[PDB]
Amino acid sequence: DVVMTQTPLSLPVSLGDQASISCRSSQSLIYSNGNTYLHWYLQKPGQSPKLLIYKVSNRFSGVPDRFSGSGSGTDFTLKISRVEAEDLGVYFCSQNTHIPYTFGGGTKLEIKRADAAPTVSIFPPSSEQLTSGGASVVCFLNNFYPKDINVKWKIDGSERQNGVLNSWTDQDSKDSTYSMSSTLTLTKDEYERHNSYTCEATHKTSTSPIVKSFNRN
Amino acid sequence: QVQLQQPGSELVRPGASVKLSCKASGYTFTNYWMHWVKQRPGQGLEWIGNIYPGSGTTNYNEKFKRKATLTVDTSSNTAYMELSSLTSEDSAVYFCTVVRMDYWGQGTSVTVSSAKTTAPSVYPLAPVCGSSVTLGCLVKGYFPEPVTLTWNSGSLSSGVHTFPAVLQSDLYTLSSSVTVTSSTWPSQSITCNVAHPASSTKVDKKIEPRG
Numbered sequence: 181d182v183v184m185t186q187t188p189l190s191l192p193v194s195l196g197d198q199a200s201i202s203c204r205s206s207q208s209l210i211y212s213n214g215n216t217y218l219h220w221y222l223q224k225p226g227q228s229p230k231l232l233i234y235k236v237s238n239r240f241s242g243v244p245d246r247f248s249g250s251g252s253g254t255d256f257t258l259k260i261s262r263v264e265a266e267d268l269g270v271y272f273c274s275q276n277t278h279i280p281y282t283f284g285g286g287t288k289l290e291i292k293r294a295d296a297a298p299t300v301s302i303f304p305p306s307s308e309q310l311t312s313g314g315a316s317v318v319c320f321l322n323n324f325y326p327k328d329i330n331v332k333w334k335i336d337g338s339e340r341q342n343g344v345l346n347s348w349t350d351q352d353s354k355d356s357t358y359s360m361s362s363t364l365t366l367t368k369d370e371y372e373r374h375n376s377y378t379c380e381a382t383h384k385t386s387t388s389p390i391v392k393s394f395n396r397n
Numbered sequence: 398q399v400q401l402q403q404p405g406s407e408l409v410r411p412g413a414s415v416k417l418s419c420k421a422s423g424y425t426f427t428n429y430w431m432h433w434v435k436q437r438p439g440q441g442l443e444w445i446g447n448i449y450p451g452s453g454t455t456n457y458n459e460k461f462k463r464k465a466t467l468t469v470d471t472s473s474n475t476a477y478m479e480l481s482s483l484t485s486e487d488s489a490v491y492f493c494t495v496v497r498m499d500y501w502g503q504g505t506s507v508t509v510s511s512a513k514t515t516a517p518s519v520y521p522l523a524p525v526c527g528s529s530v531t532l533g534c535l536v537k538g539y540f541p542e543p544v545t546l547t548w549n550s551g552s553l554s555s556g557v558h559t560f561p562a563v564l565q566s567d568l569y570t571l572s573s574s575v576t577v578t579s580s581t582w583p584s585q586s587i588t589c590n591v592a593h594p595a596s597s598t599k600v601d602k603k604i605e606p607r608g
């Protein structure tokens with residue numbers, strides 16, 4: 181029913197910066213008392229949401245003084261006066277004036293830091309896997325920034341796409357980086373038909389791709 | 398910091414029902430509305446409804462009337478949501494919360510699937526045959542989640558990257574990397590530890606160098 185429109189959907193910010201998240205309801209949020217039930221939550225990775233600001237502008241207790249909120253009618257704003265490393269996570273507005281309570285889409289706050297290139301590492305099939313007739317080839321792309329990366333697989337020069345499983349960590353809370361794992365699974369019979377397996381990563385930090393490879397001897 | 402205890406995961410079958418529990422404690426359960434929020438991976442918070450443990454009065458979100466049923470037991474200080482006629486759109490994390498007080502529970506990850514619980518295969522990942530060295534653990538073909546993967550019983554927290562599990566045809570795969578200095582391995586042993594309670598699998602894999 182009542183729609184909350186939250187922007188930006190991603191908030192890149194440097195430590196120390198002022199930032200602003202905005203939330204637009206499609207209806208007045210004044211209740212049957214004079215109050216206006218718009219809240220703000222921060223959900224840190226893995227965790228549940230926590231309450232930052234309630235009723236447009238009042239800082240919830242045990243909430244750092246650098247969060248504050250304001251607005252009226254149909255546009256509302258959560259202001260962060262000085263980003264810290266704690267502050268990464270997803271940020272939501274919610275309205276509670278109207279049943280059903282509705283939440284904004286969220287704004288993922290990214291800590292912006294200096295560029296960092298992937299630490300690529302590749303792994304041949306373990307012996308224990310190969311006896312059971314499977315051949316997985318794993319390749320870690322560790323601690324890079326920014327998050328936009330793309331990994332590629334090369335088998336005896338030619339590219340290979342069917343068989344890959346990709347996974348991506350969230351933004352590390354200590355060094356503000358990103359990692360990715362990629363596994364390419366074949367049978368033992370196909371894997372012994374090839375000689376060279378390569379793992380290629382193209383990222384912002386280089387024009388040339390980072391490449392780690394092995395041969396079966 | 399956690400007043401509401403919720404089970405961590407729960408596996409259920411399409412078309413079945415499940416009753417999720419939310420155990421209040423350390424406050425007057427009868428004094429505050431209890432709310433239920435759903436979050437599908439890829440975030441997004443949907444409010445399901447609330448109930449007032451003192452009287453039993455409920456409010457439901459029209460999107461969930463046909464799906465959810467909220468109840469209390471004021472003797473045991475427990476709240477219940479029952480999700481019935483389950484499809485895979487009901488796989489999500491389900492939260493109970495006291496809005497007025499900002500009490501939340503940890504959420505329960507509800508998996509809806511026909512797959513039978515399956516035990517992982519754990520493969521050591523030694524480096525290929527120069528200052529730091531990276532090792533891996535491959536955990537493959539298990540169901541459902543979660544698997545719990547530590548390194549040396551959690552004593553190399555720094556330098557560990559565990560990647561979110563990735564599902565494919567009712568089976569999950571899991572990988573973790575650990576990075577130490579070169580003087581540490583194979584000087585000292587590094588063992589990957591895997592637990593998957595749903596299948597009672599609890600195994601260690603010592604990373605041995607290849608050759």
Ligand SMILES: [C]C(=O)[N][C]1[C](O=P([O])([O])O[C][C]2O[C](OP([O])([O])=O)[C]([N]C([C])=O)[C](OC([C])=O)[C]2[O])O[C]([C]OP([O])(=O)O[C]2O[C]([C]OP([O])([O])=O)[C]([O])[C](OC([C])=O)[C]2[N]C([C])=O)[C](OC([C])=O)[C]1[O]
Pocket residue numbers: 211215217219234235238240276277278279429430431447456496497498
């Ligand atoms: C509007 C709304 O809703 N809001 C919400 C609520 O919650 P709960 O408790 O859960 O409840 C639920 C209910 O509600 C209502 O009822 P009444 O009787 O009250 O009116 C309704 N709703 C609607 C939409 O309608 C119902 O439904 C029906 C009937 O249908 C439901 O179910 O509430 C809460 C709380 O609020 P308040 O009351 O207002 O209070 C608050 O505030 C105040 C003031 O202050 P300042 O700062 O601002 O100045 C205070 O005092 C208080 O304190 C305490 C602790 O208590 C409070 N605070 C807080 C933080 O809270 C809300 O919550 C919030 C957060 O807001 C919600 O949202």
